[PDB]
């Protein structure tokens, strides 16, 4: 039984924060794609994700795959080679037990599509798959990307989110994509820039959140790691100022706990408390409790 | 067995709307091209002239679509272009590297001095003599030069002459290679409405089928279709910007559709233009 | 008795007219050539005019007016002496009369060996025969402009150095002292272009229709009508195909769907364009 | 498991300087084996990326870390079905023990060389894990020449001050793919050059200078012997000129020039190269008949 | 018997006007070349250096004329060639042509002269290296023996030399010419070293041009007087008209190559309706040339 | 039997004057190259990079080494460089080698003006020619010896900005060539680096006299078959030397001076009857005074 776009967006709220509009657009696009497949046809319903780095694009594509127990595989548009284009396919079969049908129900995420925008040979080569020649007609294609200059071209025609909403196929044309490639991506879902509160929730809520990991790394040391809310907010701010999105959270946390993890096993105390001054300033050492 | 110019123009009506004249011209020229290849370059002691095509129409008129359609209709290898020999190898990529079938192919050049002469060597052939070349282009200033000689845009583009293209910016040795000149006309408001309804793959039909497998009947009131037309003209996106309007109009409805139980959903003009009013729902 | 340049240009007006000034240069060039043989510059000729200006027709007419063996040759196509043997073929293999012959070389501007002939070396010598080298010279209109600082006024300022920068070598241009530039072509010469050539428009379409099982017939009135239509648009012969195609469009569109003997193109089909071609079953 | 202190302390006995990278390595290494000994969780990959000039001691550090933890070690060149060859070689020096081979360390040299600016994705399959390669620690070394430039075009002192401002995006623009960099969370950067490392360069490699010349002399019927003092001299000379490992041949050649000129015109058993020959350059290499 | 360089330059004065210095350089270059061939490549244990020539002068200066003249004066097989038409198998085509005008005699073909026009055109600023294979020497004939004269205007050469000598007129600057200047121009060192002898020509003058229209046995005036002569009409060129023609040629910078283009255009009308008249003679005045409006005087 | 580096440097003294240090380097470099091939390897490529001013004798050295080892030699200009044109150098090596695969693998290949392709298409050539240097007709380019001349103008500077002309070129380092415009993978293929010096007045003078084919000997012979004895006073030869140095044309700019000095003299020589012509410094430096004629 296929989950309604409601059940899909609902389950997406359990992994990705915000981007509600992008999760509605994806839910509908996904439901329509598998609803069209389970009825043997009689639109390709392929997807183009347009959002900043660390917005949750790749996470969304992987989540959709799990929620539908469907074989999923990634790929970078930078590593693209015509015989390497089918390599993505064999990888989908590898994680599909080499089942032709279940592999046709699969989802394929292509990262950094905005990077190959003239390169044009890759667009046309990968274009052969999107259409279909196992047949690649059945599988869903999700093309992520940051599209930097895109925010400019759209403005030259019409916040960053309000501008990305007025996105048009002609805008992607001027950006560097070819017509025949854009016509294969009818569904365009745009994600907004993550705020601070979302980032803080990413550091806490998820079952694999950074804090939980380090609290577990410090836990097997016999030490209790405590992240004060001020410290988490500081990390969020530290990440935004670097525009690294949620991808630049670990690079902050590691740098903050570096010294402490170094001379931790050579100490004997109860717990270590990380304050905001430890993050922002980076000068002050973390609180130590014996 | 080659499809008569009638059969070709007929199948072209199933994907492209209007431009009936451009379709006759394309149908004839295409028929003569492949009728020429099967018989041979030389026929009865006389050498037959290659009839390459030059599409002259506004952006989003259907030039690229036409070229594509013609290729599919004739199950012939097709490839676009905007390194000159790179186009050929690509034609070979989609042709299974078959030399013969790749000579029967069609090559569309979009947005048509050194490049003119470099691409000219292909048009002639060195083989690239066999393949058909369709050169698209909007030719903005062309509407002016023609007016300064002959003394709507369609009536003027009909008076197009090889000399007009010369003054435009093309070289004589390149234009002589494009005997067939097909001109597409300005799309009308009524034309757009027909694009949403008439074609066998028109938008309304796609969605009426998407909603249909939901057990729901989707009904587009003519007002809504006219609204979609205007909305598309104000954005100058032509026919390319139609889907972006329909999707946006039916976004909310498709979201919580499989979560309801009703007979049909009706899209009024208020749902398109205003975008504030939700589509009528009938249980 | 050799015809004075007057008589030569006068007879040239029966086959070609228009811009003039080349029929004079050619008349002078030609007169001097045979006035020099029957008794000193080589007096070879270089025709520089748009396609369909009547360069080819001009060359042939000159041959007929002087009852002299004529033969053409494409600059695009041991093969160099092939032109000679052909000149002997139309000359009854008469060495002397073949030396008085005229040779026209088309599309010279495209090649920017043959030089060895122009000079002169079968046993016949190529020093005696007159060489007329035609060509459109597209980029030539530009190089002249970048120096002197209508296309006709520019082609009048033509200089051997302009042909050099164009793509012609000095030793080859020095062999062609006489340089004639023509624009437009006479109505008659146009009619002959649609007929005479081995690749004439009517022959092509007559062959195109021929493989349909249909016989295409062009009435002289139609050919005349195509000629005028071409002059009114100043497109010359380059604007001939754009008339024929437009005249035979409808016919070729629903031709493969018919079953009839032949199709006849009257003048009413061309000029008026309203009346449909005569159809015979 | 040895504390990062004990680890950094033992690293000081084989490599000089680069204390910061040695801390970064001690922590990342400790956290990697501390995470394996507890079977993850009933956790980051903790993989390492070494960014330092050639001859800085990257390779040396990787080997030392392996010996200090009595863990199976194996190298590999990013320049050279062959991806799993490194694994079988790791099992070769591990007595084919699956478990002990999983706790092993793998050093990949010249990663900056494969930066497209397929191998990255192929090797990426291992970093993730499919014996499973998930358990083993990966240390990816490299000089990253153009890296010093891209960081400067973003941050806007010494190369060391710029390599400290290194960011994942800088590597992206350099030529590395996102999915590959995300696998190397730990980035340690070396500054100055290592002396003992250089000496190992002149000896250890299968194509080392001394080995090449000893052979050149060998086909002369002469045994070339390099005294460790001379090799040390050559290392120092290379550091003073900041030429690194690239400026070693230019030193050896210059040191063996006169010898090779009038060697074929002599008849003796072997030539010995002392430190006096190299540093002073005044004394001629000892000759034995 | 070989003509002393003097006899060579003297005979060069009968076909070329001015350019005395370059004629001197050629005379010596030519004399030594054949004086070298007859004696043999090697002379008295020492190997004599091949002295090929590089002519550097404006267009229509007389470069081609000098090369041809030298060839006739020594009754030696001559052949031209353009550096623009240059193809490695086409480089030997020049040789087969030399054999064609030499009755396929190997030895006499080796004594031949080969003029290469527009060398300055092939300056990259391959062919230089391909043609360089001939200059050195490798049908079975060897190209070592044949003398090579490489012509060329070298437009930009007048500039580079100025940017060097500075640390007068074009003539004074071309005199300061140096192999390194040709290097910077666009010629490869190995190619320039093959052209030791460098003769430069000066830009023609009015007085010279007028003598060009008169003195030579094939001067334009003599040709047209002959063309008019077989018409029964005597053509008279007034010195003023000849002067006018000179000036017209100078203003166009066409040199001596643009003289015929001036005479033809001046005598066009006259030659057109000449065979349709019956008079004694025609006299071309300056008014007929410069103004071009006035028709030539007609005498019955 | 391979000639010891001594014998090699010795025979190089008989064609090239000075450059002793470079000759030694080349002598070792060459001997090791053919000592390594003769034993079928088993080893460094032993490829050479000549760095000297124009007309110092780089090309001469390469040609002399070839002849001394009776080995097929061929040149090539880095300027004329096309990836399929690089193998043209090979077919040419086979042309002068009677198309013998083995002997063509023993050959020497000189590439002139390498300093010119330094990107400071150029880099593309370096990497293209680099494929040869490594080794891939059917002949392999791993066996043949590659010598790459070049003036390296700006090199004199970069070296100075580091060490802080001959004494500076001696301090040459592979990193200096890097900054110059050569890629690392290319320089690493040219381990041996011989540097030449700017020919001294005395060296130039010797060039005009000593060589069995010296200019003076040629002209003395050309004049000799005229029945005239040519005398070059040492002052004139030095005068010519200075003239060639001020122009920087190295030794390539010698003939261009002598021919110019003896122009007028050879013009009206066959038209005279005297014993001998004596060329004083005044004939060259002044250029104004005519040569001394003796009857
Ligand atoms: N909206 C979100 N809600 C919750 N977690 C998020 C969100 N966005 C990112 N993350 C987390 O932050 C990490 C960022 O990595 P990715 O999701 O791969 O970034 P990305 O934006 O998909 O990178 P791209 O688009 O391929 S350049 C992921 O592991 C997510 O778990
Ligand atoms: N006359 C028409 N009838 C039906 N659909 C059309 C028509 N014109 C355009 N379209 C559709 O709108 C889209 C516009 O893309 P194209 O057809 O490539 O436009 P185009 O005018 O060919 O663009 P150019 O000429 O390359 S700038 C196509 O995907 C067509 O499906
Ligand atoms: N110094 C001169 N004395 C007499 N007649 C000359 C002189 N220079 C040129 N002419 C004549 O003017 C004509 C000019 O043509 P050329 O001699 O071919 O010019 P050119 O300078 O040789 O052209 P190049 O060097 O090949 S670009 C020749 O036919 C000569 O007869
Ligand atoms: N050291 C030397 N001893 C004797 N003769 C020399 C010496 N150097 C140059 N020559 C002569 O002077 C001439 C100069 O030409 P080349 O040797 O080609 O100059 P080059 O320095 O090799 O030029 P490059 O390296 O290609 S820029 C040669 O013909 C040599 O015969």
Q: Which CATH architecture has domain D192-289?
A: Orthogonal Bundle (1.10)
CATH 3.40.50.300 fits D1-191, yes or no: yes
Could you tell me where the DSSP H helices lie in chain A? Answer: 5-12, 20-37, 57-67, 87-94, 100-104, 120-131, 150-155, 160-165, 169-175, 179-182, 196-204, 210-217, 229-240, 250-262, 276-279
Structure tokens at B138: 């909007």
Among B13, B24, B103, B104, residue whose Cα is nearest residue B65 = B13
Atom in ligand 4 nearest the alpha carbon of residue F62: 22
Distance CA D18, CA D28 (A): 16
- Touching chains, C (3+ CB pairs < 8 A): B, E
Judged by its nearest atom, the ligand closest to the C-alpha of residue E201 is 3
- Tell me if domain C1-183 and domain C184-281 are identical in fold: no
Contact E283, E297 (CB under 8 A): yes
Distance CA A224, CA E219 (A): 112
Structure tokens at C92: 């009854």
Backbone angles phi, psi at F258, to 5 degrees: -65, -45
Helix (H, G, I), strand (E, B) or coil at D226: strand
* Torsion angle of the four alpha carbons C109, C110, C115, C120, in this order, in degrees rounded to the nearest 10: -80
Non-local CB neighbours of F78 within 8 Å, separated by 6+ positions? F111, F112, F113, F114, F116, F117, F125, F129, F148, F150
CATH code linked to domain F198-295: 1.10.8.60
Among F3, F6, F13, residue whose Cα is nearest residue F210 = F13
Contact B213, A35 (CB under 8 A): yes
Among F257, F258, F262, residue whose Cα is nearest residue F226 = F262
Q: After which residues is chain C broken (C to N over 2.5 A)?
A: 39, 77, 112, 121, 149
D216, D249, D250 member nearest F32 (Cβ): D216
Chain F residues closer than 8 Å to D220 by CB: 35
Ramachandran sector of residue E106 (left: φ over 0; alpha: ψ -120 to 50; beta: rest): alpha
Distance CA C182, CA E167 (A): 53
Chain E residues closer than 8 Å to C4 by CB: 275-276
Backbone angles phi, psi at B107, to 5 degrees: -120, 120
Distance CA E2, CA E11 (A): 13
Structure tokens at D174: 């350099």
Among B98, B95, B105, B96, residue whose Cα is nearest residue B129 = B105
Structure tokens at A225: 């790691």
Among E145, E209, E142, E199, residue whose Cα is nearest residue E171 = E199
Sign of the C-alpha dihedral, residues A24, A25, A28, A34?
A: negative
Chain C residues closer than 8 Å to B161 by CB: 233, 235, 239, 242
Q: Which CATH architecture has domain C184-281?
A: Orthogonal Bundle (1.10)
CATH 1.10.8.60 fits B186-283, yes or no: yes
Our answer on whether the CB atom of A125 is closer than 6 Å to any ligand 1 atom is no
DSSP 8-state code for residue C126: S
CATH of C1-183, one of 3.40.50.720, 3.30.565.10, 2.30.30.90, 3.40.50.300: 3.40.50.300
Cα–Cα–Cα angle for A43, A48, A52, rounded to 5 degrees? 165
Among F178, F58, F182, F163, residue whose Cα is nearest residue F122 = F182
Contact A242, D165 (CB under 8 A): no
Contact A191, A52 (CB under 8 A): yes
Q: Using alpha carbons, list the distances in angstroms from residue C117 to C48, C108, C121, E163.
A: 21, 15, 7, 45
Judged by its nearest atom, the ligand closest to the C-alpha of residue D178 is 1
Distance CA D28, CA A262 (A): 9
Cα–Cα–Cα angle for D5, D6, D12, rounded to 5 degrees? 90
Distance CA F73, CA F89 (A): 10
Cα–Cα–Cα angle for E150, F62, F22, rounded to 5 degrees? 125
C206, C235, C253 member nearest B163 (Cβ): C235
Contact E228, E254 (CB under 8 A): no
Backbone angles phi, psi at C35, to 5 degrees: -75, -20
Distance CA C106, CA C135 (A): 6
Contact residues of ligand 3, CB 6 A cut-off: C 170; E 16-19, 59-65, 117, 151, 153, 212, 216, 256-257
Q: Pairing mode, if any, of strands C262-265 and C215-218?
A: parallel
H or E stretch at B108: strand B106-109
Q: Pairing mode, if any, of strands E78-82 and A187-190?
A: unpaired
Structure tokens at E204: 């023609």
Task: Output the furthest CA–CA distance in chain F (Å, rounded).
Answer: 71
> Across the strands, what pairs with E282?
E235, E298
Ordered by start, the domain boundaries in chain F are: 1-197, 198-295
Residue B218's CB is within 10 A of a number of other CB atoms, namely 23
Distance CA F251, CA F261 (A): 16
Look at ligand 1, atom 10, and give the residue with the nearest C-alpha. A56
Backbone angles phi, psi at C36, to 5 degrees: -90, -25
Distance CA B167, CA B156 (A): 16
Helix (H, G, I), strand (E, B) or coil at E258: coil
Please tell me the distance between residue E198's alpha carbon and the centre of ligand 3 in angstroms.
18
Burial class for A232, CB neighbours closer than 10 Å (0-12, 13-18, 19+) = buried
E1-202: which CATH topology?
Rossmann fold (3.40.50)
Sign of the C-alpha dihedral, residues D27, D32, D36, D41?
A: positive
Structure tokens at C107: 């599309």
Contact D217, D224 (CB under 8 A): yes
CA E77 to chain CA mean position, Å = 17
CATH code linked to domain E203-300: 1.10.8.60
CATH of A193-290, one of 1.20.1110.10, 3.40.50.620, 1.10.8.60, 3.40.50.300: 1.10.8.60
Chains F and A touch (3+ CB pairs under 8 A): no
Distance CA B203, CA B239 (A): 11
Q: After which residues is chain A broken (C to N over 2.5 A)?
A: 42, 80, 118, 133, 158
A1-192: which CATH topology?
Rossmann fold (3.40.50)
Round to the nearest angstrom and report the end-to-end CA distance of chain E.
55
DSSP 8-state code for residue D192: S
Among D113, D126, D151, D112, residue whose Cα is nearest residue D47 = D126
Distance CA D238, CA D154 (A): 32
Backbone angles phi, psi at E100, to 5 degrees: -65, -40
Q: Which of B13, B108, B239, B241 has most ligand 2 atoms within 8 Å of its beta carbon, as the pocket-test mutant?
A: B239
Non-local CB neighbours of B133 within 8 Å, separated by 6+ positions? B52, B53, B106, B107, B109, B122, B123, B177, B178
Distance CA F195, CA F23 (A): 9
Q: Pairing mode, if any, of strands B180-183 and D270-273?
A: unpaired
Q: At what angle do helices D209-218 and D249-261 cross, to 10 degrees?
A: 10
Backbone angles phi, psi at A164, to 5 degrees: -70, -15
Our answer on whether the CB atom of A248 is closer than 6 Å to any ligand 1 atom is no
Distance CA B11, CA F53 (A): 75
Distance CA B229, CA B235 (A): 10
Among F115, F136, F110, F107, residue whose Cα is nearest residue F186 = F115
Distance CA C126, CA A138 (A): 73
* Torsion angle of the four alpha carbons E54, E57, E62, E65, in this order, in degrees rounded to the nearest 10: 20
Residue B114's CB is within 10 A of a number of other CB atoms, namely 6
Q: Pairing mode, if any, of strands E78-82 and E42-43?
A: unpaired
Among E52, A104, C123, residue whose Cα is nearest residue F255 = E52
Residue recorded with tokens 């032993």: F46
Contact A54, A245 (CB under 8 A): yes
Round to the nearest angstrom and report the end-to-end CA distance of chain D.
55
Sign of the C-alpha dihedral, residues C47, C49, C50, C53?
A: negative
Distance CA E227, CA A137 (A): 83
Could you tell me where the DSSP H helices lie in F78-214? Answer: 88-95, 101-105, 122-134, 155-163, 166-169, 174-180, 184-187, 201-209
Chains D and B touch (3+ CB pairs under 8 A): no
Among D221, D49, D29, D213, residue whose Cα is nearest residue D136 = D29
Among A227, A205, A229, residue whose Cα is nearest residue A217 = A227
- Sheet with D105-109: strands ordered across: D73-77, D105-109, D137-140, D48-51, D186-189
Q: After which residues is chain F broken (C to N over 2.5 A)?
A: 42, 81, 120, 136, 164
Distance CA F230, CA B225 (A): 105
Burial class for A290, CB neighbours closer than 10 Å (0-12, 13-18, 19+) = exposed
Helix (H, G, I), strand (E, B) or coil at C262: strand
Q: Using alpha carbons, list the distances in angstroms from residue D185 to A100, D44, D137, D182.
A: 36, 8, 12, 6
Structure tokens at E292: 């071009």
Among E122, E195, E191, residue whose Cα is nearest residue E153 = E122
Burial of A185-202, coded b for 16+ CB within 10 Å and e otherwise, reads bbbbbbbbbbeeebbbbb
Helix (H, G, I), strand (E, B) or coil at B132: strand
Distance CA C20, CA E272 (A): 14
Helix (H, G, I), strand (E, B) or coil at C147: helix
DSSP line for E39-107: H-SEETTEEPPP--EEEE--TTSSHHHHHHHHHHHTT--EEEEETT---TTTTTHHHHHHHHTTTT-HH
User: Which residues does F contribute to its contact with E (CB < 8 Å)?
Assistant: 54, 75, 77, 79-80, 112, 212-213, 215, 217-218, 220-222, 224-225, 247-249, 252-253, 255-256, 259, 263-264, 266-271
Among F226, F222, F216, residue whose Cα is nearest residue F270 = F226
Q: At what angle do helices A210-217 and A196-204 cross, to 10 degrees?
A: 40
Ramachandran sector of residue E206 (left: φ over 0; alpha: ψ -120 to 50; beta: rest): alpha
CA atoms within 13 A on the CB side of F99: 1
CATH 3.30.2350.10 fits B1-185, yes or no: no
H or E stretch at D173: helix D168-174
Could you tell me where the DSSP H helices lie in E230-299? Answer: 239-251, 260-272, 286-289
Contact E212, E222 (CB under 8 A): no
Structure tokens at F110: 């000189």
Q: At what angle do helices B222-234 and B189-197 cross, to 10 degrees?
A: 120
DSSP 8-state code for residue F286: I
Backbone angles phi, psi at E53, to 5 degrees: -120, 145
Residue recorded with tokens 């002393």: E4
Q: Which CATH architecture has domain F1-197?
A: 3-Layer(aba) Sandwich (3.40)
Distance CA C45, CA C173 (A): 10
Among F60, F193, F81, F74, residue whose Cα is nearest residue F131 = F81
Q: Pairing mode, if any, of strands E297-299 and E281-284?
A: antiparallel
Residue B248's CB is within 10 A of a number of other CB atoms, namely 13
Please tell me the distance between residue B73's alpha carbon and the centre of ligand 2 in angstroms.
17
Burial of E42-68, coded b for 16+ CB within 10 Å and e otherwise, reads ebeebebbbbbbbbbbbbbbbbbbbbb
Q: Which of A9, A59, A251 has most ligand 1 atoms within 8 Å of its beta carbon, as the pocket-test mutant?
A: A59
Among B230, D121, D116, residue whose Cα is nearest residue A74 = D121
Distance CA F64, CA F55 (A): 15
DSSP line for C177-199: -EEEE--S--HHHHHHHTTSSTT
Q: Which of F14, F23, F60, F78 has most ligand 4 atoms within 8 Å of its beta carbon, as the pocket-test mutant?
A: F60
Non-local CB neighbours of B140 within 8 Å, separated by 6+ positions? none
Residue D39's CB is within 10 A of a number of other CB atoms, namely 8
Among D136, D18, D22, D16, residue whose Cα is nearest residue D86 = D136
Burial class for F146, CB neighbours closer than 10 Å (0-12, 13-18, 19+) = buried
Burial class for D203, CB neighbours closer than 10 Å (0-12, 13-18, 19+) = middle
Contact D273, D225 (CB under 8 A): yes
DSSP 8-state code for residue F41: -
Among D65, D88, D66, D74, residue whose Cα is nearest residue D7 = D65
Distance CA C260, CA C217 (A): 14
Q: Using alpha carbons, list the distances in angstroms from residue A248 to A205, A251, B140, D52.
A: 17, 5, 48, 23
Burial of A25-47, coded b for 16+ CB within 10 Å and e otherwise, reads bbbbbbbbbbebbeeeeebbbbb
Q: Pairing mode, if any, of strands F145-148 and F48-51?
A: parallel
Distance CA F25, CA F58 (A): 13
CA atoms within 13 A on the CB side of D231: 19
Sign of the C-alpha dihedral, residues C183, C188, C194, C196?
A: negative
CA atoms within 13 A on the CB side of D45: 23
């Amino acid at each position: 039984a296929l989950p309604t776009p409601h059940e899909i967006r609902n389950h997406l709220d359990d992994y990705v924060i915000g981007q509600e509009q992008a999760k509605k657009v994806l839910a509908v696009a996904v439901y329509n794609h598998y609803k069209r497949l389970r009825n043997g046809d009689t639109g390709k319903s392929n997807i183009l994700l347009i959002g900043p780095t660390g917005s949750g694009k790749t996470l969304l594509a992987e989540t959709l795959a799990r929620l539908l127990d469907v074989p999923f595989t990634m790929a970078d548009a930078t590593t693209l080679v015509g015989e390497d284009v089918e390599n993505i396919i064999q990888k989908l079969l590898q994680k599909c037990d080499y089942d032709v049908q279940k592999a046709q129900r699969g989802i394929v995420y292509i990262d950094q599509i905005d990077k190959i925008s003239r390169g044009e040979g890759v667009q046309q080569a990968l274009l052969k798959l999107i259409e279909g020649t196992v047949d690649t007609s059945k599988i869903l294609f999700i093309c992520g990307g940051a599209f930097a200059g895109l925010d400019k071209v759209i403005s030259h025609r019409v916040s960053e989110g309000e501008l990305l909403a007025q996105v048009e196929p002609e805008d992607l044309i001027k950006f560097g994509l070819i017509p025949e490639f854009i016509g294969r991506l009818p569904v365009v879902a745009t994600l907004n820039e993550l705020s601070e509160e979302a980032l803080i929730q990413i550091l806490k809520e998820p079952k694999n959140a950074l804090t939980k990991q380090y609290q577990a790394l410090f836990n097997l040391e016999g030490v209790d790691l405590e992240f004060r809310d001020e410290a988490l907010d500081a990390i969020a701010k530290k990440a935004m100022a670097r525009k690294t999105g949620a991808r630049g959270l670990r690079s902050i946390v590691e740098a903050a706990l570096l010294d402490t993890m170094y001379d931790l096993p050579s100490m004997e105390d109860v717990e270590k408390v990380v304050i905001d001054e430890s993050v922002i300033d980076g000068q002050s050492e973390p609180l130590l409790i014996y």
